[PDB]
Amino acid sequence: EPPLLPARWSSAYVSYWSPMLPDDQLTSGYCWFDYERDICRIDGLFNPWSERDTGYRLWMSEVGNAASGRTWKQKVAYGRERTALGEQLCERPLDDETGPFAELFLPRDVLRRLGARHIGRRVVLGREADGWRYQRPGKGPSTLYLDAASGTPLRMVTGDEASRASLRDFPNVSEAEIPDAVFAAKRLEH
Amino acid sequence: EPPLLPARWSSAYVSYWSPMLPDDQLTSGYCWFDYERDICRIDGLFNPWSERDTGYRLWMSEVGNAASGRTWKQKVAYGRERTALGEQLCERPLDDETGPFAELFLPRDVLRRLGARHIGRRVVLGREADGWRYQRPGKGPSTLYLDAASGTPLRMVTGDEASRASLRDFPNVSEAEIPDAVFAA
């Protein structure tokens, strides 16, 4: 039987792509998943985000509350300008955005509910990890690599890594209690 | 009269440069400062880090304990390779590093102790901010922008913004309690 994810976990993340196409970015941030509260949070430069199409790079903090079914997003745009010194970045916050949020980005029981199959051990972040491969119905395959000893997430592959996939690595997972203020939202009217 | 920073604060950060030169990076991460414990933590892609000089990009989590005078750094390298499936990144954890750590990256009393002067108000991250400019002895100037209402950090400028400086923005500062586990190292 596939395992459940930890009841609560938080970690830095590193987000990138396989293969790395020329516009693909390597970014970092922090994330928190609390399955008992049924809420998650992700803070970092949004990946993927087309600066060419939009005119800016986006930083975002998102609190996705699956219990209430609503997400809250705090966004800051970083756009390029030209000055006497050369190129400069200018920050511009956006008003907070809200919308529907039907499930957490990585549900605790995802491997059980989607019928994941074990595809062997892989060295991920310096130790053996269990690979669990499953189909996201109507979307495509995913593989979640879990630390073989602790069961904590190490790498989330969304898509087929041998063709085209997002990779997210979790180098320092903690199962410690998460203060509820981590998941608080507020109105930001600019 | 320069204020103290909040007794405890944590925030996402966005790190970049003025001006942005071709190899300069815009990066993000998260940080925590607990001045009563006398400890801080920063997690993110290391900025600045020359992939040209080194051959890789570096992710790091550092817990700097000014009470004990020691820091602990966890490191993961990301290097480029080319396979039959295309260009790829390969990760490699590095050995943990420990070393001396004589003060926090942003001491609570930095503005008072280094004799900062108020250089005026500025809008930073859509908020009214007070700019406090000071000299880091034997290094160069810095300007710290604090929210004019809450006193929380909004932007740290390290160096002269009009020549060459690092900028770090703090979009979502929280003064909430920080669990012990955040600083366990």
Side-chain angles (χ1 to χ4, degrees), chain A residues 1-80 82-188, chain B residues 2-80 82-185:
Chain A
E1 186 186 20
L4 296 176
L5 280 153
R8 54 196 324 145
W9 64 277
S10 59
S11 187
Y13 73 82
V14 178
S15 183
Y16 56 106
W17 293 85
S18 178
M20 285 293 280
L21 298 174
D23 293 346
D24 291 340
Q25 305 301 119
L26 174 68
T27 60
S28 54
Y30 204 88
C31 68
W32 297 258
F33 286 84
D34 187 327
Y35 298 121
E36 295 298 334
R37 296 192 179 110
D38 203 16
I39 193 152
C40 67
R41 174 177 167 186
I42 298 171
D43 284 26
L45 287 161
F46 197 92
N47 192 342
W49 187 263
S50 177
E51 182 174 15
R52 186 73 192 88
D53 298 341
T54 65
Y56 58 89
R57 287 170 284 193
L58 177 62
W59 175 87
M60 184 167 81
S61 172
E62 179 170 7
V63 177
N65 185 337
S68 71
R70 298 292 291 178
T71 187
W72 172 85
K73 300 175 188 176
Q74 176 186 8
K75 293 175 170 191
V76 180
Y78 282 85
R80 297 159 191 244
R82 292 203 177 185
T83 71
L85 293 184
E87 182 170 286
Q88 301 286 2
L89 303 188
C90 285
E91 91 292 352
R92 186 170 61 192
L94 284 64
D95 287 0
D96 27 47
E97 168 174 311
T98 58
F101 194 76
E103 72 177 10
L104 305 175
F105 295 114
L106 197 56
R108 190 181 179 192
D109 57 356
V110 64
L111 302 181
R112 293 182 175 186
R113 294 291 293 177
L114 296 182
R117 60 185 164 91
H118 190 267
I119 52 77
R121 290 283 179 87
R122 186 81 192 168
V123 180
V124 178
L125 288 163
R127 75 284 218 173
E128 288 194 23
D130 289 306
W132 290 97
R133 186 158 292 166
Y134 56 98
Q135 178 71 5
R136 291 165 295 126
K139 294 190 197 183
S142 289
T143 308
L144 182 59
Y145 293 92
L146 301 177
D147 183 290
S150 69
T152 53
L154 280 170
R155 172 174 294 146
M156 176 187 187
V157 179
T158 308
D160 178 1
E161 189 177 345
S163 181
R164 177 57 174 182
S166 155
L167 271 65
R168 290 156 194 188
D169 292 351
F170 305 107
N172 60 349
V173 172
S174 172
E175 295 186 57
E177 297 295 301
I178 300 166
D180 69 334
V182 165
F183 301 114
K186 66 152 68 75
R187 193 148 213 283
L188 299 175
Chain B
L4 295 179
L5 275 47
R8 184 183 56 244
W9 64 278
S10 63
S11 187
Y13 72 83
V14 179
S15 185
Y16 55 106
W17 292 85
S18 175
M20 290 291 283
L21 301 173
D23 291 333
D24 289 342
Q25 303 299 304
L26 173 66
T27 61
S28 53
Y30 201 88
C31 66
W32 298 257
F33 286 83
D34 187 326
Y35 298 123
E36 288 301 311
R37 291 191 177 103
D38 204 15
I39 192 155
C40 68
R41 174 178 168 183
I42 300 174
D43 285 26
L45 287 165
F46 197 104
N47 192 342
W49 187 266
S50 177
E51 187 173 12
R52 295 203 195 281
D53 306 0
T54 69
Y56 58 92
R57 289 175 283 191
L58 177 65
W59 174 86
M60 185 166 83
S61 173
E62 176 167 11
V63 177
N65 186 340
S68 71
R70 301 293 292 172
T71 188
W72 170 85
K73 301 170 189 180
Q74 188 193 346
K75 301 182 179 197
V76 181
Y78 284 85
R80 288 173 172 284
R82 196 167 285 154
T83 69
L85 304 166
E87 191 140 342
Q88 310 292 338
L89 301 190
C90 283
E91 49 77 12
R92 175 182 295 182
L94 307 181
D95 288 338
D96 290 354
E97 174 190 334
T98 60
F101 193 77
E103 73 187 319
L104 302 177
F105 294 114
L106 197 55
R108 191 180 179 189
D109 59 353
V110 64
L111 302 182
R112 292 185 172 184
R113 298 291 293 175
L114 295 185
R117 59 185 297 265
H118 190 271
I119 61 158
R121 293 277 185 79
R122 188 173 178 161
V123 178
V124 177
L125 290 160
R127 288 162 269 186
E128 194 174 54
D130 290 311
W132 292 96
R133 196 164 191 283
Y134 56 97
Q135 182 70 9
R136 292 168 291 125
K139 294 189 193 191
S142 290
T143 309
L144 181 59
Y145 292 92
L146 301 177
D147 190 290
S150 70
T152 54
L154 284 165
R155 170 177 293 151
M156 177 58 83
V157 182
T158 305
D160 182 347
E161 182 170 39
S163 179
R164 178 61 170 175
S166 150
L167 271 67
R168 291 161 191 184
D169 291 351
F170 304 106
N172 58 354
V173 173
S174 171
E175 293 184 63
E177 193 181 315
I178 300 163
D180 288 341
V182 167
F183 299 118

